Amino acid sequence: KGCELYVQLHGIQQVLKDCIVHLCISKPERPMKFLREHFEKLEKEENRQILARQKSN
Amino acid sequence: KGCELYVQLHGIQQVLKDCIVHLCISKPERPMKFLREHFEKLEKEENRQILARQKSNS
């Protein structure tokens, strides 16, 4: 785990706990499509914070 | 607390464990885009295995 640092830098630790919880609620018939859509929302957020930092100078 | 079973039944632990490995190897700058793309490939498999069953179910 020379990747130890990347993981805390990106939250990651936390990100994957909230999937298990998201899945435990909905318990979908199709966890793989579910997680694609879940992470398609979190990719939308990821980008907002990106375009946002492309305004600070 | 019966997501213990849900997780068991869908082998969710093994799946999550592989995500964190794929990130730790590739260490992307954008890990959400990465993971959406990741589960996009895993979904396709899942839909290949679903439509395999509707064929042979009858």
Swiss-Prot record, chain A:
The free-text tissue note of the record is: Four types of regulatory chains are found: I-alpha, I-beta, II-alpha, and II-beta. Their expression varies among tissues and is in some cases constitutive and in others inducible.
Q: Where found?
A: Cell membrane
What is known about its processing and modification? The pseudophosphorylation site binds to the substrate-binding region of the catalytic chain, resulting in the inhibition of its activity.
Q: Which residues carry this modification: 3'-nitrotyrosine?
A: Y6
The record's subunit annotation is: The inactive holoenzyme is composed of two regulatory chains and two catalytic chains. Activation by cAMP releases the two active catalytic monomers and the regulatory dimer. Interacts with PRKX; regulates this cAMP-dependent protein kinase. Interacts with C2orf88/smAKAP; this interaction may target PRKAR1B to the plasma membrane.
Per the UniProt record, the associated disease is:
Marbach-Schaaf neurodevelopmental syndrome: An autosomal dominant neurodevelopmental disorder characterized by global developmental delay, speech delay, behavioral abnormalities, hypotonia, and movement disorders including dyspraxia, apraxia, and clumsiness. More variable features include high pain tolerance, sleep disturbances, and variable non-specific dysmorphic features.
Q: What does this protein do?
A: Regulatory subunit of the cAMP-dependent protein kinases involved in cAMP signaling in cells.
Give the protein family: Belongs to the cAMP-dependent kinase regulatory chain family.
What name appears for this protein in its UniProt entry?
A: cAMP-dependent protein kinase type I-beta regulatory subunit
| Organism encoding this protein | Homo sapiens (Human)
Which gene specifies this protein's sequence?
A: PRKAR1B
